[PDB]
Amino acid sequence: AEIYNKDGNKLDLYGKIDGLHYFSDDKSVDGDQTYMRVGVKGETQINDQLTGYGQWEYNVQANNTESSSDQAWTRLAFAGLKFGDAGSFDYGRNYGVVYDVTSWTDVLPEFGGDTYGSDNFLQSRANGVATYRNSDFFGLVDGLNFALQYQGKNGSVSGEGATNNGRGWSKQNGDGFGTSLTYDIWDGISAGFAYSHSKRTDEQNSVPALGRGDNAETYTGGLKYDANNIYLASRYTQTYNATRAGSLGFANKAQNFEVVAQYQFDFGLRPSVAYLQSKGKDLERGYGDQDILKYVDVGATYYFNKNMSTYVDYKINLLDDNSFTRNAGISTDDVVALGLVYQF
Amino acid sequence: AEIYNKDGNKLDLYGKIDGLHYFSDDKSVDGDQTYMRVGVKGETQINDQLTGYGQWEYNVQANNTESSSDQAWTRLAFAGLKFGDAGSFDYGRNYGVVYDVTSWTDVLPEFGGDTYGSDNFLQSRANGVATYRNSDFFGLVDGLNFALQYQGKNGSVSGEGATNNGRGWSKQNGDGFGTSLTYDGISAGFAYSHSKRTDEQNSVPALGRGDNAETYTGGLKYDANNIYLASRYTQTYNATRAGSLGFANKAQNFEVVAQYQFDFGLRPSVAYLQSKGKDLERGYGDQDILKYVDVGATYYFNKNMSTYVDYKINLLDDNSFTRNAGISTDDVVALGLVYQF
Amino acid sequence: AEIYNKDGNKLDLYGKIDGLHYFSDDKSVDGDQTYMRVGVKGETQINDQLTGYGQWEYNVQANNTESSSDQAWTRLAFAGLKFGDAGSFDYGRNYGVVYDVTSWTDVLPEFGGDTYGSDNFLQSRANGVATYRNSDFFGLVDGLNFALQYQGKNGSVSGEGATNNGRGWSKQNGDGFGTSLTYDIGISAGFAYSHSKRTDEQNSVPALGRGDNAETYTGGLKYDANNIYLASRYTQTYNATRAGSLGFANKAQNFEVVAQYQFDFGLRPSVAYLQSKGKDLERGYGDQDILKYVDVGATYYFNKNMSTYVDYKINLLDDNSFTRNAGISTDDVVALGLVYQF
Ligand SMILES: [Mg+2]
Ligand SMILES: [Mg+2]
Ligand SMILES: [Mg+2]
């Protein structure tokens, strides 16, 4: 909600409160999943060719007790400058540019968006990203959106590989960069490409048993159709030393594919059907080729209005239980989600 | 404070900042107790019959350092729909319906509200509650309200009894149900709850054994002519904590409070509270779990600022039960200055 | 931002989002340092001579992951009354009155303000402070301000020295009090004093620092006019200045000086020198430098809501047994920040 707009400065206090329950035979996901999000988004006019901005987004779990630990975290926190019509720069915790394309399939009622994770190189939300964007390809092509992003090393907790803000191997990165390019081809049809290259860290190449290599790389292509009450999107990503092999490390190579179809009825119901897979290749310890993710998703959202909705989502999990999924901690069970959400 | 009201949607950013200090011989409660609360309450008009709403309430302690852990937590987080005469429905972290009645005695300047706890079946705030409420009995009887409530299992951290949101035995529950009924300046109230207990509750702590946690509550309130009087009695089975040692197989909990509101802003308060545990294992037998007289006063400067003193006159004796279970037997004085928004 | 003002009550929701990176050979400070702050400040008119107020300020780190621990904390939380000319009183988590004067040199683009820390007696933000303030000496002497402050013990986690809100020896305190006095002659002078009981764990746990009381004495001078900022202050402490992780300095001498200029087009360069000199340290340490650097940097103000900055800590400490064992950083640091304020 816009709660301040005065003398060239604007502030939005926004969020949602999501009354959410999961039903699954997997006891690590079954049960109450209630949470909320709260954030601020602000803008300050500097001059005719310059606007300042900042955004913070917080996640607050509400499915555990008042004595539980580690229930809140920051999703986004960045500050930036917009340079007229010709671009922007921001720095902080923000989305990696790969998500410029992979966001197109991250539209399921509840599930989806899970062939990658957060703090996973530049695939999703990430610490310390400096992001340059231009929406007219340097004045040459209207509608052609370019991004270039740099990320500094976020290393180990201690020792030779450390930085101030250290973390475990699954969420480490070396210095890296990303780029994306997206374009509306026809009315309502868009195409996009993204690439990332990051140095890996010494702990990534020594602590977990899976995944070895100097660099983490991703290649993504996507398509979207959004018109006439119909939403279709597909994307394909090939990764190298970048996709998590559950708790066991990284996949030397992975091939990640998502497709989604939705329809918006004018009375407020939006059914959704999707297919997702992540195919790991050349895994160590005799694993070879393994499925990391494989499910059909069917669900629907009912929008009461712009501030209130309810939804059901059903993850039909096609993974077989085997020594890889067991050892890596990957859920092979179906899940049903039921939600009622207030947004502000 | 209402900070947004536009095109059918309203948002309140509300809270308080409570500069609070306790004086006690009990070193685990003595000292600075400053904290604040902040929350949002939102409502959206969907159509003539239907409004959607959400509420989040956060508690933020401010009595420890900037390197201290576990200083903030969510009290409430729920989303709901209100229908008209048909009632309301909400889901999330919210009050158990037993508090619809026991709240009538939870009005002391600082203390009170402590014969039960949070995440304690449906006695107070709870995870994963679905709550239906009906006002005026479908519009047929003015002042008659009722509620129906369901809670899904919140299990252990790992193993066979787990759920995603696992916790220790003290705050676990199986599937449960609660109901309340209140009727009106004089009011009477009843509440009942029934929850399945978990395998950890029946094996980890030494105290309390049974398949089910049950509560029965009756209460009365007089609120008129600047006088507030309230009393309630609750009988529980396998549901009242015996401090850190488990649950009381049975307990009998009683509270009574009297207050007067002077025009100039002073509100003195006198109360008596007790919790009596029966049939405790390990030789404990019958034990007092809580017993005190409370005297205090709140001074309201206005609707946004108050100050208060409260004096817990603790009538428990020190014994091996109070020591082992971590129950305070010392007197406490609280002094507070509070800003509300 | 003031987001509510109605029927005698007002509320400000304020903060900043600071996109911040450090470059250093010290791996414990090097890298992303992005964070934000958010708070509320409210006031309510009670009557002609009485206003109530409250403030909360929260710090939220954003430089680590979504599964990281302990990433947020309360800086300030207090409630108070202002009685016109008779003064104000507030209680909660608030600044110690020593900061009334030492804040004069806490103006660097990024660094500075580090000859003391938080929860460090009455040197900075502190739990359980009751603070009386009087502005312009009961309305009788423009520019003459004073404060009186009391702080109850904040003790150990358990045992005989416990309080409900226990913490480690570095952040403990006994009962104490403090006072400040400032006088505006754009030119000001200031004095502050504090005296606290030390706690048993401050004497029994760490290697360094022994004594029943912690005391500080501060004097400051400030020139702030004609686009020029010049400030200096000197503090002598007893059993009160941390000697890194090793304990406290039996005596310390802390000195800071800063000069800045505000150009009309927005740039504010800054040059400063800071040192903390510890004396009579145990275990053979004797006299040791606790802090010693020159700071050079600049802030560019786009407007009142947006700025960018660079800061360069030129660290004059050396690797020796003291800095090494105390965990005191000896390396240079460059900070680069972009900050949105609301
Ligand atoms: Mg490889
Ligand atoms: Mg029993
Ligand atoms: Mg000494």
mmCIF file of C-alpha atoms in Angstrom, chain A residues 56-318:
data_model
loop_
_atom_site.group_PDB
_atom_site.id
_atom_site.type_symbol
_atom_site.label_atom_id
_atom_site.label_comp_id
_atom_site.label_asym_id
_atom_site.label_seq_id
_atom_site.Cartn_x
_atom_site.Cartn_y
_atom_site.Cartn_z
ATOM 1 C CA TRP A 56 13.429 -4.360 1.597
ATOM 2 C CA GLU A 57 11.410 -7.557 1.755
ATOM 3 C CA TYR A 58 11.186 -9.673 4.946
ATOM 4 C CA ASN A 59 9.841 -13.187 5.449
ATOM 5 C CA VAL A 60 8.380 -13.990 8.864
ATOM 6 C CA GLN A 61 7.343 -17.612 9.557
ATOM 7 C CA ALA A 62 4.369 -18.041 11.818
ATOM 8 C CA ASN A 63 4.061 -21.853 11.828
ATOM 9 C CA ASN A 64 6.275 -22.418 14.869
ATOM 10 C CA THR A 65 6.279 -21.400 18.523
ATOM 11 C CA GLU A 66 7.224 -18.174 20.302
ATOM 12 C CA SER A 67 10.406 -19.904 21.584
ATOM 13 C CA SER A 68 11.517 -21.185 18.132
ATOM 14 C CA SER A 69 14.695 -19.935 16.466
ATOM 15 C CA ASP A 70 15.538 -18.546 13.046
ATOM 16 C CA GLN A 71 11.905 -17.759 12.004
ATOM 17 C CA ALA A 72 12.540 -14.537 10.012
ATOM 18 C CA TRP A 73 14.879 -13.549 7.183
ATOM 19 C CA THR A 74 15.490 -10.910 4.571
ATOM 20 C CA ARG A 75 14.611 -11.814 1.021
ATOM 21 C CA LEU A 76 15.589 -8.506 -0.589
ATOM 22 C CA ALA A 77 17.465 -5.336 0.473
ATOM 23 C CA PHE A 78 18.876 -3.033 -2.161
ATOM 24 C CA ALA A 79 19.423 0.613 -3.054
ATOM 25 C CA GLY A 80 19.581 2.007 -6.518
ATOM 26 C CA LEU A 81 19.506 4.839 -9.036
ATOM 27 C CA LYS A 82 17.320 5.073 -12.150
ATOM 28 C CA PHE A 83 18.915 7.180 -14.892
ATOM 29 C CA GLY A 84 16.030 8.662 -16.849
ATOM 30 C CA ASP A 85 14.513 6.241 -19.355
ATOM 31 C CA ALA A 86 18.029 4.947 -20.115
ATOM 32 C CA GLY A 87 18.637 2.527 -17.183
ATOM 33 C CA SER A 88 19.265 1.572 -13.623
ATOM 34 C CA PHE A 89 21.868 0.396 -11.170
ATOM 35 C CA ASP A 90 21.244 -1.249 -7.824
ATOM 36 C CA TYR A 91 23.369 -3.049 -5.192
ATOM 37 C CA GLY A 92 22.473 -5.275 -2.226
ATOM 38 C CA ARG A 93 20.531 -8.505 -1.793
ATOM 39 C CA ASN A 94 18.535 -8.926 -4.981
ATOM 40 C CA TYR A 95 17.565 -11.448 -7.642
ATOM 41 C CA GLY A 96 20.216 -12.888 -9.893
ATOM 42 C CA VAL A 97 19.633 -12.054 -13.530
ATOM 43 C CA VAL A 98 18.949 -15.674 -14.446
ATOM 44 C CA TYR A 99 15.552 -15.137 -12.731
ATOM 45 C CA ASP A 100 14.781 -12.482 -15.387
ATOM 46 C CA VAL A 101 13.945 -15.519 -17.574
ATOM 47 C CA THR A 102 13.209 -18.304 -15.076
ATOM 48 C CA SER A 103 10.592 -16.156 -13.275
ATOM 49 C CA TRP A 104 8.381 -16.759 -16.298
ATOM 50 C CA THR A 105 7.560 -20.300 -15.077
ATOM 51 C CA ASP A 106 7.540 -19.333 -11.355
ATOM 52 C CA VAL A 107 3.772 -18.726 -11.403
ATOM 53 C CA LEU A 108 2.254 -21.788 -9.764
ATOM 54 C CA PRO A 109 -0.382 -21.403 -7.074
ATOM 55 C CA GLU A 110 2.089 -22.573 -4.398
ATOM 56 C CA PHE A 111 4.800 -24.926 -5.674
ATOM 57 C CA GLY A 112 7.253 -24.520 -8.611
ATOM 58 C CA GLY A 113 10.368 -22.338 -8.815
ATOM 59 C CA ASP A 114 12.432 -25.113 -7.304
ATOM 60 C CA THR A 115 14.962 -26.418 -9.880
ATOM 61 C CA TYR A 116 17.246 -23.784 -8.221
ATOM 62 C CA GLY A 117 17.255 -22.177 -4.756
ATOM 63 C CA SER A 118 18.158 -18.957 -2.976
ATOM 64 C CA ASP A 119 21.853 -18.111 -2.479
ATOM 65 C CA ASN A 120 22.517 -20.377 -5.474
ATOM 66 C CA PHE A 121 24.913 -18.381 -7.564
ATOM 67 C CA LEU A 122 22.789 -16.022 -9.683
ATOM 68 C CA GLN A 123 19.787 -18.271 -10.078
ATOM 69 C CA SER A 124 17.626 -16.482 -7.440
ATOM 70 C CA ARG A 125 18.005 -14.089 -4.482
ATOM 71 C CA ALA A 126 21.697 -13.518 -3.779
ATOM 72 C CA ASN A 127 23.979 -11.404 -1.521
ATOM 73 C CA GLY A 128 26.166 -8.685 -2.903
ATOM 74 C CA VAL A 129 24.854 -8.303 -6.469
ATOM 75 C CA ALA A 130 25.528 -5.153 -8.463
ATOM 76 C CA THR A 131 22.995 -5.012 -11.266
ATOM 77 C CA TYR A 132 22.919 -2.739 -14.307
ATOM 78 C CA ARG A 133 19.710 -2.738 -16.439
ATOM 79 C CA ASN A 134 18.698 -0.962 -19.664
ATOM 80 C CA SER A 135 15.227 -1.265 -21.244
ATOM 81 C CA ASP A 136 15.925 0.024 -24.831
ATOM 82 C CA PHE A 137 19.294 -1.686 -25.639
ATOM 83 C CA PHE A 138 21.353 1.464 -25.152
ATOM 84 C CA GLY A 139 18.873 3.557 -27.220
ATOM 85 C CA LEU A 140 18.980 1.145 -30.220
ATOM 86 C CA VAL A 141 15.882 -1.091 -29.763
ATOM 87 C CA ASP A 142 12.707 -0.257 -27.837
ATOM 88 C CA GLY A 143 11.520 -3.109 -25.631
ATOM 89 C CA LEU A 144 14.869 -4.920 -25.637
ATOM 90 C CA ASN A 145 15.783 -5.416 -21.995
ATOM 91 C CA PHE A 146 19.426 -6.049 -21.118
ATOM 92 C CA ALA A 147 21.031 -6.724 -17.737
ATOM 93 C CA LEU A 148 24.627 -7.142 -16.567
ATOM 94 C CA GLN A 149 25.289 -8.247 -13.016
ATOM 95 C CA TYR A 150 28.420 -8.772 -10.879
ATOM 96 C CA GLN A 151 28.671 -10.599 -7.588
ATOM 97 C CA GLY A 152 31.644 -10.588 -5.241
ATOM 98 C CA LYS A 153 32.808 -13.713 -3.427
ATOM 99 C CA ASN A 154 30.627 -14.825 -0.458
ATOM 100 C CA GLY A 155 32.940 -17.359 1.199
ATOM 101 C CA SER A 156 33.394 -19.698 4.122
ATOM 102 C CA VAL A 157 32.709 -18.945 7.774
ATOM 103 C CA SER A 158 36.415 -19.121 8.699
ATOM 104 C CA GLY A 159 39.796 -19.939 7.269
ATOM 105 C CA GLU A 160 41.486 -19.091 3.991
ATOM 106 C CA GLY A 161 38.283 -18.886 1.938
ATOM 107 C CA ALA A 162 36.426 -16.602 4.351
ATOM 108 C CA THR A 163 34.536 -13.350 3.927
ATOM 109 C CA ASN A 164 32.771 -11.354 6.679
ATOM 110 C CA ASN A 165 29.445 -12.876 5.722
ATOM 111 C CA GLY A 166 30.462 -16.483 5.470
ATOM 112 C CA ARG A 167 28.163 -19.450 5.002
ATOM 113 C CA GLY A 168 28.152 -23.175 4.191
ATOM 114 C CA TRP A 169 29.323 -24.653 0.860
ATOM 115 C CA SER A 170 25.771 -24.965 -0.548
ATOM 116 C CA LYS A 171 25.375 -21.152 -0.456
ATOM 117 C CA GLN A 172 28.938 -19.997 -1.211
ATOM 118 C CA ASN A 173 30.135 -18.337 -4.361
ATOM 119 C CA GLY A 174 33.297 -16.927 -5.830
ATOM 120 C CA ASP A 175 33.396 -13.787 -7.972
ATOM 121 C CA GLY A 176 30.905 -14.026 -10.803
ATOM 122 C CA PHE A 177 28.772 -12.372 -13.406
ATOM 123 C CA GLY A 178 25.476 -12.769 -15.166
ATOM 124 C CA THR A 179 23.723 -11.289 -18.180
ATOM 125 C CA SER A 180 20.139 -11.469 -19.513
ATOM 126 C CA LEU A 181 18.314 -10.323 -22.629
ATOM 127 C CA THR A 182 14.525 -10.353 -22.990
ATOM 128 C CA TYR A 183 12.243 -9.132 -25.792
ATOM 129 C CA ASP A 184 8.573 -8.974 -26.813
ATOM 130 C CA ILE A 185 8.564 -10.687 -30.246
ATOM 131 C CA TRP A 186 4.855 -10.374 -31.082
ATOM 132 C CA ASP A 187 2.121 -8.782 -29.059
ATOM 133 C CA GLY A 188 2.071 -10.869 -25.838
ATOM 134 C CA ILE A 189 4.908 -13.256 -26.863
ATOM 135 C CA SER A 190 8.306 -12.860 -25.207
ATOM 136 C CA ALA A 191 11.665 -14.560 -25.525
ATOM 137 C CA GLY A 192 14.589 -14.498 -23.186
ATOM 138 C CA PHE A 193 18.104 -15.706 -22.655
ATOM 139 C CA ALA A 194 20.403 -15.610 -19.641
ATOM 140 C CA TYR A 195 23.941 -16.691 -18.843
ATOM 141 C CA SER A 196 25.961 -16.828 -15.641
ATOM 142 C CA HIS A 197 29.592 -17.647 -14.769
ATOM 143 C CA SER A 198 30.906 -17.764 -11.195
ATOM 144 C CA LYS A 199 34.075 -19.017 -9.645
ATOM 145 C CA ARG A 200 33.465 -21.944 -7.268
ATOM 146 C CA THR A 201 35.093 -22.046 -3.821
ATOM 147 C CA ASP A 202 37.579 -24.460 -2.266
ATOM 148 C CA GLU A 203 34.963 -25.794 0.164
ATOM 149 C CA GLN A 204 32.605 -26.522 -2.742
ATOM 150 C CA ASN A 205 35.390 -28.613 -4.325
ATOM 151 C CA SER A 206 36.295 -30.477 -1.119
ATOM 152 C CA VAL A 207 33.514 -30.752 1.525
ATOM 153 C CA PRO A 208 30.597 -32.365 -0.327
ATOM 154 C CA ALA A 209 31.227 -35.539 -2.318
ATOM 155 C CA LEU A 210 29.341 -34.398 -5.455
ATOM 156 C CA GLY A 211 30.480 -31.828 -8.025
ATOM 157 C CA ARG A 212 33.965 -30.744 -9.015
ATOM 158 C CA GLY A 213 35.082 -27.789 -11.135
ATOM 159 C CA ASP A 214 36.571 -24.325 -11.097
ATOM 160 C CA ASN A 215 33.408 -22.566 -12.369
ATOM 161 C CA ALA A 216 29.623 -22.647 -11.990
ATOM 162 C CA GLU A 217 27.856 -21.827 -15.280
ATOM 163 C CA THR A 218 24.232 -21.577 -16.419
ATOM 164 C CA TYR A 219 22.609 -21.211 -19.840
ATOM 165 C CA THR A 220 18.865 -20.406 -20.013
ATOM 166 C CA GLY A 221 16.343 -19.935 -22.837
ATOM 167 C CA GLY A 222 12.661 -19.092 -22.226
ATOM 168 C CA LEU A 223 9.375 -18.292 -23.957
ATOM 169 C CA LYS A 224 6.151 -16.766 -22.660
ATOM 170 C CA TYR A 225 2.704 -16.159 -24.107
ATOM 171 C CA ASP A 226 0.495 -13.823 -22.072
ATOM 172 C CA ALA A 227 -2.688 -12.640 -23.744
ATOM 173 C CA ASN A 228 -6.368 -13.393 -24.209
ATOM 174 C CA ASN A 229 -6.728 -14.764 -20.648
ATOM 175 C CA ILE A 230 -4.110 -17.456 -21.471
ATOM 176 C CA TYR A 231 -0.666 -17.830 -19.865
ATOM 177 C CA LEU A 232 1.936 -20.262 -21.313
ATOM 178 C CA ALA A 233 5.611 -20.333 -20.521
ATOM 179 C CA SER A 234 8.503 -22.696 -20.987
ATOM 180 C CA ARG A 235 12.170 -22.583 -20.152
ATOM 181 C CA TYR A 236 15.239 -24.756 -20.444
ATOM 182 C CA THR A 237 18.415 -24.351 -18.420
ATOM 183 C CA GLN A 238 21.674 -26.277 -18.702
ATOM 184 C CA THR A 239 23.939 -25.942 -15.661
ATOM 185 C CA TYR A 240 27.524 -26.909 -14.867
ATOM 186 C CA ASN A 241 28.598 -27.312 -11.238
ATOM 187 C CA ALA A 242 25.627 -25.071 -10.180
ATOM 188 C CA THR A 243 22.510 -27.161 -9.507
ATOM 189 C CA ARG A 244 22.307 -28.616 -5.978
ATOM 190 C CA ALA A 245 22.234 -32.400 -5.791
ATOM 191 C CA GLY A 246 20.152 -32.174 -2.588
ATOM 192 C CA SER A 247 22.429 -32.291 0.477
ATOM 193 C CA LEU A 248 25.240 -34.215 -1.393
ATOM 194 C CA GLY A 249 26.830 -31.368 -3.377
ATOM 195 C CA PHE A 250 26.305 -30.086 -6.910
ATOM 196 C CA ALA A 251 25.567 -31.848 -10.182
ATOM 197 C CA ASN A 252 28.553 -31.758 -12.545
ATOM 198 C CA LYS A 253 25.929 -31.157 -15.234
ATOM 199 C CA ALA A 254 22.166 -30.668 -15.038
ATOM 200 C CA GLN A 255 19.343 -30.115 -17.538
ATOM 201 C CA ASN A 256 16.379 -28.264 -16.053
ATOM 202 C CA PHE A 257 13.027 -27.908 -17.827
ATOM 203 C CA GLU A 258 9.737 -26.255 -16.796
ATOM 204 C CA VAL A 259 6.463 -25.727 -18.760
ATOM 205 C CA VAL A 260 3.246 -24.147 -17.453
ATOM 206 C CA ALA A 261 -0.243 -23.399 -18.771
ATOM 207 C CA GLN A 262 -2.872 -21.284 -17.052
ATOM 208 C CA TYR A 263 -6.230 -19.713 -17.827
ATOM 209 C CA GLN A 264 -7.837 -16.695 -16.177
ATOM 210 C CA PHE A 265 -11.634 -16.779 -15.945
ATOM 211 C CA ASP A 266 -13.169 -13.299 -15.588
ATOM 212 C CA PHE A 267 -15.035 -14.396 -12.412
ATOM 213 C CA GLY A 268 -11.666 -14.900 -10.641
ATOM 214 C CA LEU A 269 -10.633 -18.579 -10.966
ATOM 215 C CA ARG A 270 -7.217 -19.343 -12.422
ATOM 216 C CA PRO A 271 -6.443 -23.040 -13.026
ATOM 217 C CA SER A 272 -2.875 -24.087 -13.596
ATOM 218 C CA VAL A 273 -1.100 -27.184 -14.948
ATOM 219 C CA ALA A 274 2.692 -27.617 -15.085
ATOM 220 C CA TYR A 275 5.562 -30.029 -15.546
ATOM 221 C CA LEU A 276 9.035 -29.640 -13.972
ATOM 222 C CA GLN A 277 12.190 -31.690 -14.094
ATOM 223 C CA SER A 278 15.834 -31.472 -13.141
ATOM 224 C CA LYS A 279 18.086 -34.148 -14.700
ATOM 225 C CA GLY A 280 21.548 -34.503 -13.083
ATOM 226 C CA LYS A 281 24.436 -35.970 -15.104
ATOM 227 C CA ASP A 282 27.933 -37.300 -14.335
ATOM 228 C CA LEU A 283 27.393 -37.519 -10.594
ATOM 229 C CA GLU A 284 30.155 -39.103 -8.425
ATOM 230 C CA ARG A 285 30.045 -42.142 -6.112
ATOM 231 C CA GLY A 286 28.392 -44.242 -8.828
ATOM 232 C CA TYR A 287 25.241 -42.113 -9.061
ATOM 233 C CA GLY A 288 25.825 -41.273 -12.770
ATOM 234 C CA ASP A 289 22.596 -39.914 -14.199
ATOM 235 C CA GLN A 290 19.864 -39.139 -11.622
ATOM 236 C CA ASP A 291 16.553 -37.278 -11.432
ATOM 237 C CA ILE A 292 16.878 -34.400 -8.933
ATOM 238 C CA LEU A 293 13.279 -33.127 -9.416
ATOM 239 C CA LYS A 294 10.324 -34.505 -11.395
ATOM 240 C CA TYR A 295 6.676 -33.565 -10.910
ATOM 241 C CA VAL A 296 3.383 -32.608 -12.483
ATOM 242 C CA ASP A 297 1.636 -29.733 -10.794
ATOM 243 C CA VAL A 298 -2.120 -29.082 -10.878
ATOM 244 C CA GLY A 299 -3.900 -26.355 -8.952
ATOM 245 C CA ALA A 300 -5.968 -23.231 -8.941
ATOM 246 C CA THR A 301 -6.245 -19.850 -7.386
ATOM 247 C CA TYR A 302 -9.483 -18.012 -6.756
ATOM 248 C CA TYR A 303 -9.030 -14.229 -6.604
ATOM 249 C CA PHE A 304 -11.740 -12.557 -4.462
ATOM 250 C CA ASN A 305 -10.175 -9.221 -5.479
ATOM 251 C CA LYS A 306 -6.633 -7.732 -5.714
ATOM 252 C CA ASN A 307 -6.142 -8.077 -1.932
ATOM 253 C CA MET A 308 -7.609 -11.513 -1.145
ATOM 254 C CA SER A 309 -7.292 -14.997 -2.657
ATOM 255 C CA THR A 310 -7.533 -18.670 -1.821
ATOM 256 C CA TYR A 311 -5.765 -21.532 -3.553
ATOM 257 C CA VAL A 312 -5.100 -25.252 -3.846
ATOM 258 C CA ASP A 313 -2.000 -26.805 -5.362
ATOM 259 C CA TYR A 314 -1.152 -30.486 -5.886
ATOM 260 C CA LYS A 315 2.389 -31.657 -6.480
ATOM 261 C CA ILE A 316 2.227 -35.093 -8.170
ATOM 262 C CA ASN A 317 5.744 -36.261 -7.430
ATOM 263 C CA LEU A 318 7.158 -38.568 -10.095
#
